[PDB]
Coordinates of C-alpha atoms in Angstrom, one line a residue:
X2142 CA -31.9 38.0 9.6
X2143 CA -28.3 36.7 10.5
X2144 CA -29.7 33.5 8.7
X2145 CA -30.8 35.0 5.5
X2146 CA -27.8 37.2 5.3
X2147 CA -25.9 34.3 5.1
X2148 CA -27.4 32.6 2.2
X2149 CA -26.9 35.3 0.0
X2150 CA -23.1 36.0 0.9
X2151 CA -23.0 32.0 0.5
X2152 CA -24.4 32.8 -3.2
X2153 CA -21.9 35.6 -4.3
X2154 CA -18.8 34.4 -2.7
X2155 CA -17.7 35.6 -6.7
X2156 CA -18.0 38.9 -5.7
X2157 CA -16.0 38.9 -2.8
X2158 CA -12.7 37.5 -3.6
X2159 CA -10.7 40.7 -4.6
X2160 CA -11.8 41.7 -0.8
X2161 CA -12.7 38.8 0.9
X2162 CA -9.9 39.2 3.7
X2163 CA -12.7 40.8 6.0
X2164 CA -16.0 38.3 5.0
X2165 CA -14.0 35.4 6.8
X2166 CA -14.5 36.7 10.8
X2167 CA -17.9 36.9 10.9
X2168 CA -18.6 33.9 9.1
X2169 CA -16.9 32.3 11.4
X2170 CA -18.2 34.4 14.5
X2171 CA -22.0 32.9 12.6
X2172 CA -20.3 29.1 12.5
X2173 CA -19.2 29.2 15.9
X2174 CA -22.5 30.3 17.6
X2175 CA -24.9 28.0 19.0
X2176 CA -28.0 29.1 18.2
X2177 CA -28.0 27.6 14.8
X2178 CA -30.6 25.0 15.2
X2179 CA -30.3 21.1 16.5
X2180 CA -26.4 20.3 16.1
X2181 CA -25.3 22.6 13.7
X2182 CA -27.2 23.3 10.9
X2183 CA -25.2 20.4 9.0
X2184 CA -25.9 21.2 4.8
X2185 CA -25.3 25.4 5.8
X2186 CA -22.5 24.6 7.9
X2187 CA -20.6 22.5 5.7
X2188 CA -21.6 25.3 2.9
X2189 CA -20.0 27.4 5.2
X2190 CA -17.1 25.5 5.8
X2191 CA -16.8 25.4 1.6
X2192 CA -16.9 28.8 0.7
X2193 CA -14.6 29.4 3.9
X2194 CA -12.1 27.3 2.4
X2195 CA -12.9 28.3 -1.0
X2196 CA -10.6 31.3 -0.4
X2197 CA -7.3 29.3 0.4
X2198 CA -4.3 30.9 0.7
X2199 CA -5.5 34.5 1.9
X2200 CA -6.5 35.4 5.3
X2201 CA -5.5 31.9 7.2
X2202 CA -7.4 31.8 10.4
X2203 CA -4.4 32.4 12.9
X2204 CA -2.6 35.4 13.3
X2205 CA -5.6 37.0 15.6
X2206 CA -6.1 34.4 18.8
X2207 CA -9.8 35.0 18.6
X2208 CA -9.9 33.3 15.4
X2209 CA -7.5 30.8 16.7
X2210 CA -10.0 29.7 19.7
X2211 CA -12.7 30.3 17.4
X2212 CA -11.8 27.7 14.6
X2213 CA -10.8 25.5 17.7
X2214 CA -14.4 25.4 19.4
X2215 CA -15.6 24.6 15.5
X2216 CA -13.1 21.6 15.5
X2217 CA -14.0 21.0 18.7
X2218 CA -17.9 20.6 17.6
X2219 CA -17.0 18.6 14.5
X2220 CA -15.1 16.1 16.6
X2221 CA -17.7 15.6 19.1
X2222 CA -21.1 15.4 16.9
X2223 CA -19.8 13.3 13.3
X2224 CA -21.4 9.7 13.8
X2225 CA -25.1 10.1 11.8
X2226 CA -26.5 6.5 11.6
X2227 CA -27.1 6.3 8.0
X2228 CA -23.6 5.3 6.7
X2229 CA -23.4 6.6 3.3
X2230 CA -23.0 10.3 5.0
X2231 CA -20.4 9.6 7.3
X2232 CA -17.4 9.3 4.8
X2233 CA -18.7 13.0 3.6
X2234 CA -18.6 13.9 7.4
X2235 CA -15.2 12.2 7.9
X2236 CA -14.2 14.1 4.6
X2237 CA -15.3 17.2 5.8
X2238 CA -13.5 16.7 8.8
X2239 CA -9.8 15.6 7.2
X2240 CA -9.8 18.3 4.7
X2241 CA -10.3 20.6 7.5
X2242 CA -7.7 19.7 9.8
X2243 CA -5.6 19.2 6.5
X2244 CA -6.1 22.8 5.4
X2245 CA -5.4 24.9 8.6
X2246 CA -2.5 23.3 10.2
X2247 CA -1.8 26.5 11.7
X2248 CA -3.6 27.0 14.9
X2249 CA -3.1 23.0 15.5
X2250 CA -4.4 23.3 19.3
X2251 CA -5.9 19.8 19.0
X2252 CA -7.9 18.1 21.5
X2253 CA -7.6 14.8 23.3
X2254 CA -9.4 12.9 25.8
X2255 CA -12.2 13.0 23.8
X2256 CA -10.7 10.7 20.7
X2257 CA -9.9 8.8 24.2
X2258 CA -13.4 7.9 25.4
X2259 CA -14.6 7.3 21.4
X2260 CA -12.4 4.6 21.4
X2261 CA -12.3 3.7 25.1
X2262 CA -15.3 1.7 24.6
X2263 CA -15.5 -1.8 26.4
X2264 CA -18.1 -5.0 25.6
X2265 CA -16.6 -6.4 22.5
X2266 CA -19.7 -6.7 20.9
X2267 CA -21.0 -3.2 19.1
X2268 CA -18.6 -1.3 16.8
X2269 CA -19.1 2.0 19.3
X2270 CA -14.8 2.5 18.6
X2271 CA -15.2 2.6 14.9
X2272 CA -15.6 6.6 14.8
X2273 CA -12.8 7.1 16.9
X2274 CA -10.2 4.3 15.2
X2275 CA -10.9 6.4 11.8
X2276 CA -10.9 9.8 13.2
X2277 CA -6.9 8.2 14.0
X2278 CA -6.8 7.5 10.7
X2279 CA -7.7 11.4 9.9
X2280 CA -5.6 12.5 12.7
X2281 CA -3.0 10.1 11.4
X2282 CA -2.6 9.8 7.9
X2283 CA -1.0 13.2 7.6
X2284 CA 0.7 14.5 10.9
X2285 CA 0.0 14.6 14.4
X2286 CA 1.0 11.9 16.4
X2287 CA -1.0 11.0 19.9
X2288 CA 1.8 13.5 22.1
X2289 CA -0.9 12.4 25.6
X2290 CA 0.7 13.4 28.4
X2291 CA 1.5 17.1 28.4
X2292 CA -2.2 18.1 29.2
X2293 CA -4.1 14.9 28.6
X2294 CA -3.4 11.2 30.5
X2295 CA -0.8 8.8 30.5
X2296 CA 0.2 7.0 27.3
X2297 CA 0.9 4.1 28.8
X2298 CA -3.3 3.5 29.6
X2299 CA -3.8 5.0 26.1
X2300 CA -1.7 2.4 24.3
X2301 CA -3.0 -0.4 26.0
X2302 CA -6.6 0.7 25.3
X2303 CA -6.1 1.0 21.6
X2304 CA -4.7 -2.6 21.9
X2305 CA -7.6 -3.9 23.4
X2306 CA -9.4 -2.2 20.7
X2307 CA -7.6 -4.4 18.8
X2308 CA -7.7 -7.7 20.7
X2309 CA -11.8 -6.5 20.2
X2310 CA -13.0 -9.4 17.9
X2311 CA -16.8 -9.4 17.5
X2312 CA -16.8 -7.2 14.3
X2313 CA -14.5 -7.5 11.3
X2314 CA -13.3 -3.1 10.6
X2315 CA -12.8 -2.5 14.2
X2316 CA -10.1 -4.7 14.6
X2317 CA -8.6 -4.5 11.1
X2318 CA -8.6 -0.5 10.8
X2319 CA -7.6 -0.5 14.4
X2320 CA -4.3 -2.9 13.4
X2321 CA -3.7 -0.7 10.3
X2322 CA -3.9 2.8 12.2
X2323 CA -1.5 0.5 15.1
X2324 CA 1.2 0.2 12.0
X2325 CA 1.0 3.6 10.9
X2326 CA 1.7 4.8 14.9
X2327 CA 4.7 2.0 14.6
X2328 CA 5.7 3.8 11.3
X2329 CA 5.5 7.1 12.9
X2330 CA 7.8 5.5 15.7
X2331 CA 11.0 3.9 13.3
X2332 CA 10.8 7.1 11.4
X2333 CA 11.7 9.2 15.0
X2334 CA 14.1 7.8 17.8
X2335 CA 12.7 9.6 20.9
X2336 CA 9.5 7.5 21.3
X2337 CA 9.4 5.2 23.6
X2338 CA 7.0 2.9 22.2
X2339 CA 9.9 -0.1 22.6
X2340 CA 7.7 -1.7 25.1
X2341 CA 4.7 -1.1 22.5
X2342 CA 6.1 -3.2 20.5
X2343 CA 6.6 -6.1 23.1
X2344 CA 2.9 -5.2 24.1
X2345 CA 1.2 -5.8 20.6
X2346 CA 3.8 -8.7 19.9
X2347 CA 2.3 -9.9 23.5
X2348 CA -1.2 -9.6 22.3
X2349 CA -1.0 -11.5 18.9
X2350 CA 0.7 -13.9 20.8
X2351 CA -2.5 -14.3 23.3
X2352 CA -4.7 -14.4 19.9
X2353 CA -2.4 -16.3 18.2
X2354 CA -2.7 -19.9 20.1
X2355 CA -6.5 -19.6 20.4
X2356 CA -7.4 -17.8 17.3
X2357 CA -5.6 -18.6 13.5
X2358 CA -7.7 -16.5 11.1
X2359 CA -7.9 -13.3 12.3
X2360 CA -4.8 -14.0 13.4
X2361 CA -2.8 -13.6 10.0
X2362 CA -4.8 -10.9 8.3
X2363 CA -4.4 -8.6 11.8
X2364 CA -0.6 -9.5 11.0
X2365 CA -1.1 -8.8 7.6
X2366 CA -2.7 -5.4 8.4
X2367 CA 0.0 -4.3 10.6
X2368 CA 2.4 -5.4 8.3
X2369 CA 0.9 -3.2 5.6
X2370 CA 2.7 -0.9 7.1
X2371 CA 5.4 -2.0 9.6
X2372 CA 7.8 -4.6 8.0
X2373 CA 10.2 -5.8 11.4
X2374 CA 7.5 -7.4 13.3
X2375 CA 7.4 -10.2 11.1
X2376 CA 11.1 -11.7 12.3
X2377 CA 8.4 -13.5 15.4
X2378 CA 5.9 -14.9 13.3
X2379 CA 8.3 -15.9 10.7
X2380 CA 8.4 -19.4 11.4
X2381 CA 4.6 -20.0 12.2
X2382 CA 3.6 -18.9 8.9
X2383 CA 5.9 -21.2 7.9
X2384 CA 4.2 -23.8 9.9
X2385 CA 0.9 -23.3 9.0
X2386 CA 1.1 -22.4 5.6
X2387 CA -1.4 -25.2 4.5
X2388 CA -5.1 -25.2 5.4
X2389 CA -4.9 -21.7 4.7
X2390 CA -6.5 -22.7 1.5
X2391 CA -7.9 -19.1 -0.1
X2392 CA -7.2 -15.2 0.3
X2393 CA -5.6 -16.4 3.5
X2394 CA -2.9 -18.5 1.3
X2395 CA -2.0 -14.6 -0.4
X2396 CA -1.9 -13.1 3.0
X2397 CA 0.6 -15.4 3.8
X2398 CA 2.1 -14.8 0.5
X2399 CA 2.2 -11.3 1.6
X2400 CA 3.6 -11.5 4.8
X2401 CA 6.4 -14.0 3.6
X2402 CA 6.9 -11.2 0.6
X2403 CA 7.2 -8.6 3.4
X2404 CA 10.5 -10.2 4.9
X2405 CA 12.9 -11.8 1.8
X2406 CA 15.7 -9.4 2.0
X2407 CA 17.2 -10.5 4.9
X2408 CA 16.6 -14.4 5.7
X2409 CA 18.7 -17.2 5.5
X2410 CA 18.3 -19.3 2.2
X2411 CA 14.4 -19.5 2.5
X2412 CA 14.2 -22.0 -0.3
X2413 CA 14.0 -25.4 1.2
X2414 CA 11.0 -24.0 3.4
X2415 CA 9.3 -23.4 0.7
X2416 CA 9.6 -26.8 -1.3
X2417 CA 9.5 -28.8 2.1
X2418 CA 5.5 -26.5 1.9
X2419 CA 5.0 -27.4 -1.7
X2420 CA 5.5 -23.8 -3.1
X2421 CA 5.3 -25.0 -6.5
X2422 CA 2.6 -26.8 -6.0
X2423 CA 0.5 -23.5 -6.0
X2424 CA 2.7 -21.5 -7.8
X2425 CA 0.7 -23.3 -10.8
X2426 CA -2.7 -22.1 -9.0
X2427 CA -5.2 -20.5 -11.4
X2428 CA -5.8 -17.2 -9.0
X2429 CA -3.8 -14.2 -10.8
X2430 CA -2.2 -12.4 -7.6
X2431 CA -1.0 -15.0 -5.8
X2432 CA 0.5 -15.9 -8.9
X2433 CA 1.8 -12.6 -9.3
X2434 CA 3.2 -11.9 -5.7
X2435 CA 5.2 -15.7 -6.4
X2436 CA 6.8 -14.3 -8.9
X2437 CA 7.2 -11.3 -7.1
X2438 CA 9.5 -13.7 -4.2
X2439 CA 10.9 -15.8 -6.8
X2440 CA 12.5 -12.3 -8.1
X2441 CA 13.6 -11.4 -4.6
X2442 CA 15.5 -14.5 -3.4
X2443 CA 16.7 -14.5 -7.3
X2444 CA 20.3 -13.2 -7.0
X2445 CA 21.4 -15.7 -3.7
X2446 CA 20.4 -18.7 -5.1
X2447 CA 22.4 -21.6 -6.3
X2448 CA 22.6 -22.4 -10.1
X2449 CA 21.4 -26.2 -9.6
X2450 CA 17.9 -25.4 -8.3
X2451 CA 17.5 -22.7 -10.7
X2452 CA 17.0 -24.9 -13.1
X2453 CA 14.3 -26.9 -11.4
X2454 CA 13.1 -23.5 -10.7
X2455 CA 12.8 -22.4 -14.1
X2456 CA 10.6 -25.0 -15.1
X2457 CA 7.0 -24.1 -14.8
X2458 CA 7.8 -20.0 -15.3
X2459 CA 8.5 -20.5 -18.5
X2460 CA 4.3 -22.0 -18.3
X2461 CA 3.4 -18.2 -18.0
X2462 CA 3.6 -16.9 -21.7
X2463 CA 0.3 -18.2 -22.7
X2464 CA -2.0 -15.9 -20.1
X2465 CA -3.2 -12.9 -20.0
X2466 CA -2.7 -9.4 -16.9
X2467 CA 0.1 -8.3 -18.8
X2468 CA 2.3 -7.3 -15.3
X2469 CA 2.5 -11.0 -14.2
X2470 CA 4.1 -11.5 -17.8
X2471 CA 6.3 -8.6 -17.3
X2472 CA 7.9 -9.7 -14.4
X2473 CA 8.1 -12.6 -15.5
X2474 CA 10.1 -11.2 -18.6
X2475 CA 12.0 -9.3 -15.6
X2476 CA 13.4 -12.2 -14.1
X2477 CA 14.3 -13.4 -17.5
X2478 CA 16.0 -10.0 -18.0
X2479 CA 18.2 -10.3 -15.0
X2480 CA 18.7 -14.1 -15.5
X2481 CA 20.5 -12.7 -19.1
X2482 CA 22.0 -9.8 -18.0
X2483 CA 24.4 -11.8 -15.5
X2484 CA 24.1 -15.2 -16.1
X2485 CA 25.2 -15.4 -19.9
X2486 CA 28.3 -17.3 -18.1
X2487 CA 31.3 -15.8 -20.6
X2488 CA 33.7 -18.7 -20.6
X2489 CA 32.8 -20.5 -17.0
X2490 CA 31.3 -23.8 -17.7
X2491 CA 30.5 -25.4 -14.5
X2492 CA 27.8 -27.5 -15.5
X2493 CA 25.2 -28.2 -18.2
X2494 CA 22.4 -26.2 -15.9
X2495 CA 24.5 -23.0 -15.8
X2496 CA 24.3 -22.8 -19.7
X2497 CA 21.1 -24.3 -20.4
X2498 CA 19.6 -21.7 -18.1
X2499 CA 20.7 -19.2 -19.9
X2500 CA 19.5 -21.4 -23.1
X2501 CA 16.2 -21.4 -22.1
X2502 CA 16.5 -17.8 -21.0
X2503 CA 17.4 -16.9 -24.3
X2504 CA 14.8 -19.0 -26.0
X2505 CA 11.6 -17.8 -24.0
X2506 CA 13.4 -14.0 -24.1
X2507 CA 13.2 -14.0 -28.0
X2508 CA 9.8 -15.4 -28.3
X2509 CA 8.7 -12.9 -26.2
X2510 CA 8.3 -10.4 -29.2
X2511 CA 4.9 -11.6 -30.8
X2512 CA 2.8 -11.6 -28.2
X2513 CA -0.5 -9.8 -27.9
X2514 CA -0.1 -6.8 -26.7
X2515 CA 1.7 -3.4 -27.1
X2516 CA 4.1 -1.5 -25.1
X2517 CA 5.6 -4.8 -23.3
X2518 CA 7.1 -6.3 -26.6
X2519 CA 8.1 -2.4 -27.3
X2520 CA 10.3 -2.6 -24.1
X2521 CA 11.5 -5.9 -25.7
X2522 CA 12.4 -4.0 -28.7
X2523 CA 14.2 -1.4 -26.5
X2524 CA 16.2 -4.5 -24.6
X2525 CA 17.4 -6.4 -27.7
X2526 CA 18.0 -3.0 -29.4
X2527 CA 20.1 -1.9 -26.2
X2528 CA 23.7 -1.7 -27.0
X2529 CA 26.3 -4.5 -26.5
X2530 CA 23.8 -7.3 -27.2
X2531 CA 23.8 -6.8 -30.9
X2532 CA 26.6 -4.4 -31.9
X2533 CA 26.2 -1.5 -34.3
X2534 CA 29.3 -0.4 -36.3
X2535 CA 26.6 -1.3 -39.6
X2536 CA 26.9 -5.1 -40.8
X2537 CA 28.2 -6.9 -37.5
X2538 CA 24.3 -6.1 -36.9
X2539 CA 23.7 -8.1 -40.1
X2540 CA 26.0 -10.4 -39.8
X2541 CA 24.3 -10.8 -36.1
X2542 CA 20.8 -10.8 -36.6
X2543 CA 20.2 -14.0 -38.1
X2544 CA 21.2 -15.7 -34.7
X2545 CA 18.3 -14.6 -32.8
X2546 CA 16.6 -16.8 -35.4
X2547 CA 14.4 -19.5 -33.1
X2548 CA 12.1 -21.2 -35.3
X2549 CA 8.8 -21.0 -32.8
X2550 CA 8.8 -17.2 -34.5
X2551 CA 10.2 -16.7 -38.2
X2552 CA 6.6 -15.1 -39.7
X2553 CA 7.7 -12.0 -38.4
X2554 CA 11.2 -12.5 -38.7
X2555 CA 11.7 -10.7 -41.6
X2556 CA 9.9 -7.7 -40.3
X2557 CA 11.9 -7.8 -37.0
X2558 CA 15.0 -7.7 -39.5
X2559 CA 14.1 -4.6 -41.0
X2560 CA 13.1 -3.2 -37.8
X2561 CA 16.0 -3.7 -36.4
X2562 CA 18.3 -3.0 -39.6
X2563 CA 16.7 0.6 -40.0
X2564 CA 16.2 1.4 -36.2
X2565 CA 19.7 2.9 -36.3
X2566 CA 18.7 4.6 -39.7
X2567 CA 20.8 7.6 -39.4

């Protein structure tokens, strides 16, 4: 009867909501009794958990202990029975789960030791840690940090458990969620100070080192899954990227792309690593992202380098106006932007390079206006348009315009005149 007085409350939840303060307690009091049938009666309970939740923002279920303990033996239950062998329900499980301990963050009371055996699984060769690497992801991509050792074990055992969850290479997600949710812990620790994970550190640096000499390939994509997230790890494995940047030949050449793109601001000159590797080599590569995160370093070691291997270097960028994915373009109109904005070299005149790259930037900046597609050539518009590049007291704009002439575009020309006579119309 407790049963079927539920789903009917469950169907007219829109009659309760100017007085549902009291229908939450013994909903709950139902949820957490185990007489429900197997292990919860899963498609009720999570209607349950629905139409509980449905209510946000009234009658939170901590200000009355017994509702505290009693939302904590339901977390308790979700935590310990979530795995369901058919995957395409376990992200709904996993979903139910996050957007509960999302929700309530109230009566935190969160248990360990149990997250602790679900990942302290040995025999590297059955993914029996994947449910409790990704409930840390739950428990970590919002809040709540592993704080062990005030009622559960020592951190120290902990820590070197996960990393031997990640030094666990028979299956592919195990390690490389286990790496990411590693980085989001080291994440947690640079944005504190009192963490003490300064040996951590040393001991996952120690354990990519003892992969590293025997191992190569999962080597660099565990590196680039922890530095997804944690950028100062990669001032070890600087230089042996660096080394074996060849034979990497594939997604592996972007991760290393990646990784490289992670540390620019802050290394030496960087350049002559790069061309002693070939760099433009397969910066003319037909893949679009590796093409795009290129360009992406080329604009970050921009404003350091010197002006005579700019000029080699703005050879085959000028090759990418004839390609489509528009943001490759536009960064590529970016650097050109910059390269104009402070190179136009008033009156300095150390070489033929330092004006002719600002020549070609020029040329390939104002051919940039037909191209075939909106909104990029509009912020073109808006750049030549900006003020003190073409002045505007009325006919010093006339008497400027026809310099932007170039001769690769003059169909438009007139039509760009216009455009840009009557833009300052009134």
């Amino acid at each position: 009867i407790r049963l079927f007085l539920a789903k009917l409350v469950i169907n007219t939840e829109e009659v309760f909501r100017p007085y549902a303060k009291h229908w939450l307690s013994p909903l709950l009091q139902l949820a957490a009794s185990e007489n429900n049938g197997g292990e919860g009666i899963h498609y009720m309970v999570v209607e349950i958990v629905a139409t509980i939740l449905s209510w946000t923002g009234l009658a939170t279920p901590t200000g009355v202990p017994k509702d505290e303990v009693l939302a904590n033996r339901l977390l308790n239950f979700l935590m310990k029975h979530v795995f369901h062998p058919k995957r395409a329900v376990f992200r709904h499980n996993l979903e139910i789960i996050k957007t509960l301990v999302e929700c309530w963050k109230d009566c935190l009371s969160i248990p360990y030791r149990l997250i602790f055996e679900k990942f302290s699984g040995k025999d590297p060769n059955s993914k029996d840690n994947s449910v409790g690497i990704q409930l840390l992801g739950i428990v970590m991509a919002n809040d709540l940090p592993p704080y062990d050792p005030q009622c559960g074990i020592q951190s120290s055992e902990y820590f070197q458990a996960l990393v031997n969850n990640m030094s666990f290479v028979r299956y592919k997600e195990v390690y490389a969620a286990a790496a990411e949710v590693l980085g989001l812990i080291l994440r947690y620790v640079m944005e504190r100070k009192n963490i003490l994970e300064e040996s951590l550190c040393e001991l996952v640096a120690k354990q990519l080192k003892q992969h590293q000499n025997t191992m190569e390939d999962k080597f660099i994509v565990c590196l680039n899954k922890v530095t997804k997230s944690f950028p100062p790890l990669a001032d070890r494995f600087m230089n042996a990227v660096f080394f074996l940047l060849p034979k990497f030949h594939g997604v592996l050449k972007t991760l290393c792309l990646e990784v490289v793109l992670c540390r620019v601001e802050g290394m030496t000159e960087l350049y002559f690593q790069l061309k002693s590797k070939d760099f433009v080599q397969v910066m003319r590569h037909r893949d679009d992202e590796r093409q795009k995160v290129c360009l992406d370093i080329i604009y970050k070691m921009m404003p350091k380098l010197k002006p005579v291997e700019l000029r080699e270097l703005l050879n085959p960028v000028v090759e990418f106006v004839s390609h489509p994915s528009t943001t490759c373009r536009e960064q590529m109109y970016n650097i050109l932007m910059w390269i104009h904005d402070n190179y136009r070299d008033p009156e300095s005149e150390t070489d033929n390079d330092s004006q002719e790259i600002f020549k070609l930037a020029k040329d390939v900046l104002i051919q940039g206006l037909i191209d075939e597609n909106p909104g990029l050539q509009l912020i073109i518009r808006n750049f030549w348009s900006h003020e003190t590049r073409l002045p505007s007291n009325t006919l010093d704009r006339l008497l400027a315009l026809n310099s932007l002439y170039s001769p690769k575009i003059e169909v438009h020309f007139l039509s760009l005149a216009t455009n840009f006579l009557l833009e300052m119309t009134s």
